Amino acid sequence: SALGKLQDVVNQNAQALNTLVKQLSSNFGAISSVLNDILSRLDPPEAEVQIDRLITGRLQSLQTYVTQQLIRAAEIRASANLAATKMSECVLGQSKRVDFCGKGYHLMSFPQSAPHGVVFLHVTYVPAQEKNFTTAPAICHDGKAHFPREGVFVSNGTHWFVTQRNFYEPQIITTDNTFVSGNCDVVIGIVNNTVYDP
Amino acid sequence: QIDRLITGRLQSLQTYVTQQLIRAAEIRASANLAATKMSECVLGQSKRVDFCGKGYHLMSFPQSAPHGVVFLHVTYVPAQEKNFTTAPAICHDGKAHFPREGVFVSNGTHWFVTQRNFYEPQIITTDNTFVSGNCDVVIGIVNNTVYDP
Amino acid sequence: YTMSLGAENSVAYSNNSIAIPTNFTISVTTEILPVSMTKTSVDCTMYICGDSTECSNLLLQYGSFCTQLNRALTGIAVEQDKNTQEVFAQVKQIYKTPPIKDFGGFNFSQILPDPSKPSKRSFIEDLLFNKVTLANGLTVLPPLLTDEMIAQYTSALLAGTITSGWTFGAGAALQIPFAMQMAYRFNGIGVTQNVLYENQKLIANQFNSAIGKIQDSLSSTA
Amino acid sequence: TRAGCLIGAEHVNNSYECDIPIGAGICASYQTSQSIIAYTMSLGAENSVAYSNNSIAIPTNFTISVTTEILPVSMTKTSVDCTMYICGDSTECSNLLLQYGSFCTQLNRALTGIAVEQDKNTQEVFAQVKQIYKTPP
Amino acid sequence: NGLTVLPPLLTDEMIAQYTSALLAGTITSGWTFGAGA
Amino acid sequence: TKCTLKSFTVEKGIYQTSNFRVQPTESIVRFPNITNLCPFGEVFNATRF
Amino acid sequence: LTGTGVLTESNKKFLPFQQFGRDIADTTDAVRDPQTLEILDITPCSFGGV
Ligand SMILES: *[C@@H]1O[C@H](CO)[C@@H](O)[C@H](O)[C@H]1NC(C)=O
Ligand SMILES: *[C@@H]1O[C@H](CO)[C@@H](O)[C@H](O)[C@H]1NC(C)=O
Ligand SMILES: *[C@@H]1O[C@H](CO)[C@@H](O)[C@H](O)[C@H]1NC(C)=O
Ligand SMILES: *[C@@H]1O[C@H](CO)[C@@H](O)[C@H](O)[C@H]1NC(C)=O
Ligand SMILES: *[C@@H]1O[C@H](CO)[C@@H](O)[C@H](O)[C@H]1NC(C)=O
Ligand SMILES: *[C@@H]1O[C@H](CO)[C@@H](O)[C@H](O)[C@H]1NC(C)=O
Ligand SMILES: *[C@@H]1O[C@H](CO)[C@@H](O)[C@H](O)[C@H]1NC(C)=O
Ligand SMILES: *[C@@H]1O[C@H](CO)[C@@H](O)[C@H](O)[C@H]1NC(C)=O
Ligand SMILES: *[C@@H]1O[C@H](CO)[C@@H](O)[C@H](O)[C@H]1NC(C)=O
Ligand SMILES: *[C@@H]1O[C@H](CO)[C@@H](O)[C@H](O)[C@H]1NC(C)=O
Ligand SMILES: *[C@@H]1O[C@H](CO)[C@@H](O)[C@H](O)[C@H]1NC(C)=O
Ligand SMILES: *[C@@H]1O[C@H](CO)[C@@H](O)[C@H](O)[C@H]1NC(C)=O
Ligand SMILES: *[C@@H]1O[C@H](CO)[C@@H](O)[C@H](O)[C@H]1NC(C)=O
Ligand SMILES: *[C@@H]1O[C@H](CO)[C@@H](O)[C@H](O)[C@H]1NC(C)=O
């Protein structure tokens, strides 16, 4: 399955450690790669040169290792703050941000533990089965333009309806769900039909 | 001499790769900021003030650039403000009346309800007026005629 | 000079006194975020070996430092590819450019790539690409994302934005009239939909004037 | 490619999803006779939408689907003992350590800060609320 | 050679318990577990 | 901790201390148990050299 | 071979032409006692986890 992103952390940590021990395997230009040999056949006025060479080489190797692991941990901090953001409004609320917390309209996210990671269950609203329809910006009734209080003014053939944009639930045009503002001449594209009263 | 020159070159190389590596980390921080601006400015609307444009953000048009992104941050910027007179609620028939939307706003003597960011006055009517409680618990109420349709 | 903290604006908290904007302006501004950086890589043999006769003896003792540094640089290069990948391919649904006709009075010839030329480069994109002046074992790796595919991704994002609204994120590309999408994005700042539709010509003229100003300002060579 | 000449894989006029790169908008993968293949970039599935005057679309159904998003939040803690690294099992351990051990002391302080940051990563992602709740029936 | 791996403070059992508490707050209390009771 | 941080006051927390604890006081020598004399008399007294 | 560290008993078998051993270089873990021909290991004086 798609668990390679979690495996890469352990794989690269193992690569850092075994590359480090292979660095420590080197001799760094000294006469031997071990400290005990050069401390067994060299007087200190000649031994301290090789000691300095080996210690500087091992400390440079440790410097490269701590640099790699350290800014890698900074990148893991960036991803951790991203995940804690996904803890912040996907688990403890609802996110209006598109595509950040799941493909589609986000509902929830169920946290699940993982080895050195967090695995998300981003359940999402995904619409399908689209249909063509005809819309207008407003309806003029009694010389007054009528705007959608909610949803989209959606007509199929003759009956004019208002309905929300994310689901096809048709309701008849009625003044309770219809908002009126001004006359119907300034706006282009207005149609006209009977707006009912309850 | 080979050891000295190779260690000098490798020290120069490790300084170079540290500078490039955390410079790329800062570039990644800016890249995540831009991808955040790619996530609710062009894929939606951001209610965050000043984050995605000086004003109230409407849209954003992504335009390509050499090793970067330049945004087209279209924004709402209001101006031309006038002084008016306001009061938290309205009292009628011994009951406090709260704004369903907008601010209770008066000029002269007539009292109107209107949204905060545009001077579009509506007459006070029970359809856009919300009623809650009596007239005495709140401080600072004006009283007038609330109309019924 | 001393710092300019700002212009002094005298305003009053006086209660029982409110202010409402009678008239509004629409102004577009540029925010510039460098999202990618040039890829770099080093060859170990041409760096520390060079033209040395004992290239083998130099390699096994000291080339492992360069091996670590090249691994770090390769990781940086992969990170730089992923930067532009996640900023430009959040949605991987590629679109044709819609026919440029009747965009509610908003005149989108400058920002959309014209079909007259077979590159997906926009006019403002052409100005941006023209105005930016570019510039021993060090090799500059080219980026994975070429300029043509980045331009195509921006074209697809623009085409989804001005036609489908924001539904292209949820995978159905439901087409919207641009006046309706503009009204629905005015609905998010607390102002009612009547303001746009009552003054659509003024909004279109303001946006066209802003586009002209941002074209003239971004063509002064400084 | 614009990066350079690629020998060893065959190009194809079709387009497939990229997993590993080449460097010039080309990618390679394992695909079928089976061998290594090289393909151009997958810009994606092509969707034909028609912007039209006074027309709207509305979904009849909707689908609910859960997707896996995986974010590595923590990384394995490591620490280096200075004496056992630079001194090892060798004589004159005191003389080796007072001159060069503080480099390792700085690096170990950096590694301890990294370890504290790694604990704080899982602490702030998993204990934003510190009120434990028993499992409901 | 001196490379020691420090175990994390937050063990797997308590991470599982925190995850269970978050799920219990999410599916029974809703999102009020963040603020209040 | 005061020695490994080179200060007389340290704060609260955790500190990995360096190994300054034990100093050995004994020495052992082990060699192969062959005690013949090497022919340095043949080499350094070479009459025909 | 001079050094400071504790020694214990190991069970791995050497080749006839091999007398020393270093599982990882710069550690010098393996050695044979000349007197008893007992295969042993060489470890540092104390574990570093304090
Ligand atoms: C009707 O819907 C189909 C869906 O495939 C689309 O291709 C077509 O352009 C639509 N017609 C109009 C007039 O929008
Ligand atoms: C509109 O659609 C409904 C349901 O899809 C259908 O029953 C009806 O005949 C259509 N036309 C009119 C004029 O309502
Ligand atoms: C849509 O386009 C047609 C062009 O044939 C035009 O006549 C009509 O007025 C447009 N409707 C609008 C802009 O609402
Ligand atoms: C509807 O509008 C058209 C054009 O504006 C007009 O000719 C027609 O008389 C109107 N119908 C009604 C019932 O108002
Ligand atoms: C009226 O508006 C002006 C705007 O410049 C402001 O300076 C003044 O304080 C306002 N008066 C009151 C009483 O709020
Ligand atoms: C309020 O302002 C309007 C115009 O803004 C003006 O006609 C009117 O006389 C003013 N006073 C009242 C009481 O409406
Ligand atoms: C309005 O309130 C004032 C003071 O509370 C009161 O004197 C006045 O009679 C009230 N007017 C009406 C019409 O209720
Ligand atoms: C603010 O309200 C109080 C009553 O709560 C009133 O006494 C005071 O005069 C008001 N301030 C102004 C600026 O009129
Ligand atoms: C509002 O501002 C626009 C932009 O300049 C202007 O054209 C229009 O005349 C103004 N309207 C009023 C009532 O001042
Ligand atoms: C507006 O678009 C038209 C194409 O419909 C184009 O001819 C014109 O040049 C554009 N305006 C500007 C200022 O570029
Ligand atoms: C693949 O594209 C090349 C480019 O011209 C063409 O010559 C060749 O016939 C194509 N192969 C197939 C199987 O269509
Ligand atoms: C919507 O999809 C569901 C699930 O497949 C199906 O049962 C239902 O019949 C569909 N609705 C319509 C109107 O086709
Ligand atoms: C090696 O010599 C020592 C010295 O007397 C003796 O004690 C030991 O037994 C000898 N070992 C063998 C294997 O001969
Ligand atoms: C070599 O010969 C001289 C004279 O006979 C003698 O003094 C010396 O000890 C000899 N060297 C050795 C190593 O026995």
XYZ file of N, CA and C in Angstrom, chain A residues 15 19-20 23 26-29 57 60-61 64-65 68 75 98-99 103-105 125-127 130 132 135-137 147-148 151-152 165-166 179 181-182 186-188, chain C residues 60-62 64-65 68-69 71-72 79 90-93 164-177 179-181 184 187 192-195 197-198 200:
240
model
N 20.057 5.297 6.776
C 21.098 5.760 5.867
C 22.047 6.746 6.531
N 25.842 5.521 7.087
C 26.823 6.373 6.432
C 27.761 6.999 7.453
N 27.252 7.346 8.643
C 28.110 7.894 9.692
C 29.142 6.880 10.174
N 31.718 6.605 7.754
C 32.640 7.735 7.827
C 33.689 7.490 8.894
N 36.814 5.458 8.157
C 37.912 5.994 7.365
C 39.089 6.395 8.253
N 40.239 6.626 7.611
C 41.459 6.988 8.324
C 41.778 8.476 8.276
N 41.142 9.226 7.370
C 41.242 10.688 7.278
C 42.671 11.169 7.036
N 43.478 10.371 6.346
C 44.829 10.762 6.011
C 45.888 10.434 7.039
N 38.840 14.930 11.739
C 38.051 14.221 10.743
C 36.757 13.653 11.300
N 34.397 16.544 12.005
C 33.784 17.018 10.767
C 32.690 16.071 10.289
N 32.916 14.759 10.416
C 31.881 13.792 10.054
C 30.650 13.939 10.943
N 28.756 17.083 9.837
C 27.906 16.836 8.673
C 26.670 16.028 9.053
N 26.839 15.024 9.920
C 25.702 14.217 10.356
C 24.689 15.045 11.137
N 22.798 17.377 8.720
C 21.776 16.677 7.947
C 20.574 16.318 8.809
N 12.668 20.234 8.825
C 11.645 19.922 7.826
C 10.525 19.072 8.427
N -10.278 24.715 0.470
C -10.421 23.714 -0.582
C -9.083 23.018 -0.799
N -9.114 21.681 -0.826
C -8.044 20.750 -1.193
C -6.964 20.646 -0.115
N -9.671 16.030 -0.667
C -10.109 16.345 -2.026
C -11.624 16.504 -2.012
N -12.084 17.751 -2.078
C -13.503 18.040 -2.030
C -13.892 18.823 -0.794
N -15.184 18.845 -0.481
C -15.680 19.551 0.695
C -15.443 18.680 1.925
N -16.856 15.388 0.918
C -18.016 15.469 0.041
C -17.546 15.616 -1.402
N -17.926 14.670 -2.257
C -17.539 14.723 -3.667
C -18.793 14.640 -4.529
N -19.196 15.719 -5.191
C -20.392 15.668 -6.034
C -20.100 15.068 -7.402
N -23.643 15.588 -12.991
C -24.026 16.962 -13.273
C -25.073 17.020 -14.382
N -27.082 20.054 -17.090
C -27.155 21.418 -17.598
C -28.468 22.071 -17.189
N -29.882 29.666 -15.850
C -29.929 30.574 -14.716
C -30.110 32.007 -15.198
N -30.481 32.873 -14.262
C -30.579 34.307 -14.477
C -30.150 35.012 -13.199
N -29.573 36.214 -13.310
C -29.155 36.938 -12.095
C -30.294 37.292 -11.154
N -33.576 38.986 -5.848
C -32.273 38.361 -5.715
C -32.378 37.088 -4.885
N -31.466 36.128 -5.067
C -31.534 34.898 -4.261
C -31.084 35.164 -2.832
N -28.839 30.094 -2.406
C -28.899 29.255 -3.585
C -28.896 30.033 -4.895
N -29.180 29.309 -5.977
C -29.076 29.828 -7.336
C -30.453 29.757 -7.981
N -26.320 25.435 -4.548
C -25.374 25.148 -5.617
C -24.752 23.760 -5.516
N -24.763 23.137 -4.340
C -24.075 21.869 -4.139
C -25.000 20.658 -4.153
N -35.147 37.504 -1.880
C -34.773 38.824 -1.393
C -34.952 39.842 -2.512
N -34.526 43.827 -4.014
C -33.660 45.002 -3.902
C -33.760 45.806 -5.199
N -34.507 46.905 -5.158
C -34.531 47.848 -6.257
C -35.363 47.391 -7.441
N -31.671 48.167 -14.071
C -30.231 48.402 -14.021
C -29.458 47.115 -14.299
N -30.001 45.974 -13.893
C -29.296 44.703 -14.014
C -29.623 44.068 -15.360
N -28.607 43.508 -16.010
C -28.800 42.794 -17.266
C -29.107 41.330 -16.976
N 38.610 7.285 -2.333
C 38.112 6.381 -1.298
C 38.289 6.966 0.100
N 39.197 7.931 0.258
C 39.434 8.493 1.584
C 38.559 9.714 1.847
N 38.403 10.592 0.854
C 37.755 11.878 1.068
C 36.533 12.133 0.202
N 33.776 10.590 0.367
C 32.555 10.252 1.090
C 31.925 11.485 1.739
N 32.756 12.449 2.166
C 32.252 13.776 2.527
C 31.446 14.383 1.389
N 28.083 12.623 0.946
C 27.057 13.167 1.837
C 26.560 14.527 1.360
N 27.480 15.394 0.930
C 27.073 16.730 0.502
C 26.255 16.679 -0.786
N 24.373 14.059 -1.604
C 23.074 13.539 -1.186
C 22.199 14.646 -0.612
N 22.794 15.542 0.180
C 22.054 16.690 0.699
C 21.603 17.614 -0.426
N 13.399 18.643 -3.048
C 12.561 19.591 -2.320
C 12.152 20.768 -3.200
N -1.962 21.373 -7.101
C -2.902 20.936 -6.072
C -4.068 20.180 -6.690
N -4.569 20.662 -7.823
C -5.517 19.926 -8.649
C -4.800 19.521 -9.931
N -4.936 18.249 -10.302
C -4.279 17.702 -11.481
C -5.266 17.468 -12.618
N -6.227 18.371 -12.774
C -7.284 18.274 -13.775
C -7.033 19.398 -14.777
N -15.583 27.742 -13.595
C -16.226 26.770 -12.720
C -16.422 27.292 -11.302
N -15.891 28.470 -10.988
C -15.958 28.970 -9.630
C -14.855 28.372 -8.785
N -15.198 27.859 -7.606
C -14.259 27.094 -6.798
C -14.601 25.613 -6.746
N -15.543 25.153 -7.572
C -15.954 23.756 -7.534
C -14.953 22.828 -8.208
N -13.923 23.444 -8.773
C -12.955 22.610 -9.511
C -12.122 21.912 -8.461
N -12.117 22.458 -7.255
C -11.426 21.766 -6.150
C -12.121 20.469 -5.787
N -13.455 20.441 -5.822
C -14.241 19.268 -5.376
C -14.502 18.306 -6.529
N -13.823 18.485 -7.656
C -13.872 17.484 -8.739
C -15.076 17.430 -9.642
N -15.812 18.517 -9.837
C -16.902 18.402 -10.834
C -16.924 19.540 -11.854
N -16.090 20.559 -11.688
C -15.934 21.619 -12.707
C -17.251 22.235 -13.148
N -18.286 22.174 -12.341
C -19.582 22.768 -12.648
C -19.396 24.207 -13.104
N -19.827 24.509 -14.329
C -19.639 25.844 -14.880
C -20.567 26.852 -14.206
N -20.052 28.063 -14.009
C -20.774 29.161 -13.368
C -20.638 30.374 -14.281
N -21.676 31.188 -14.468
C -21.462 32.502 -15.085
C -20.570 33.354 -14.198
N -20.479 36.555 -13.669
C -21.211 37.496 -12.830
C -21.736 36.812 -11.575
N -22.200 35.567 -11.705
C -22.686 34.826 -10.546
C -21.553 34.492 -9.582
N -20.389 34.109 -10.109
C -19.240 33.828 -9.251
C -18.739 35.096 -8.569
N -21.142 35.791 -5.793
C -20.957 34.859 -4.685
C -19.678 35.137 -3.912
N -20.497 38.047 -1.777
C -21.307 37.604 -0.648
C -20.465 37.183 0.552
N -24.244 42.597 0.274
C -25.298 41.866 -0.408
C -25.018 41.845 -1.914
N -25.607 40.862 -2.603
C -25.386 40.642 -4.029
C -25.914 41.768 -4.912
N -26.747 42.666 -4.380
C -27.347 43.705 -5.208
C -26.332 44.754 -5.643
N -25.260 44.935 -4.865
C -24.293 45.997 -5.131
C -23.558 45.751 -6.445
N -24.596 43.716 -9.060
C -25.477 43.647 -10.222
C -26.073 45.005 -10.558
N -26.284 45.859 -9.553
C -26.766 47.207 -9.825
C -25.691 48.071 -10.472
N -22.738 46.750 -12.406
C -21.818 45.833 -13.076
C -20.890 46.565 -14.039
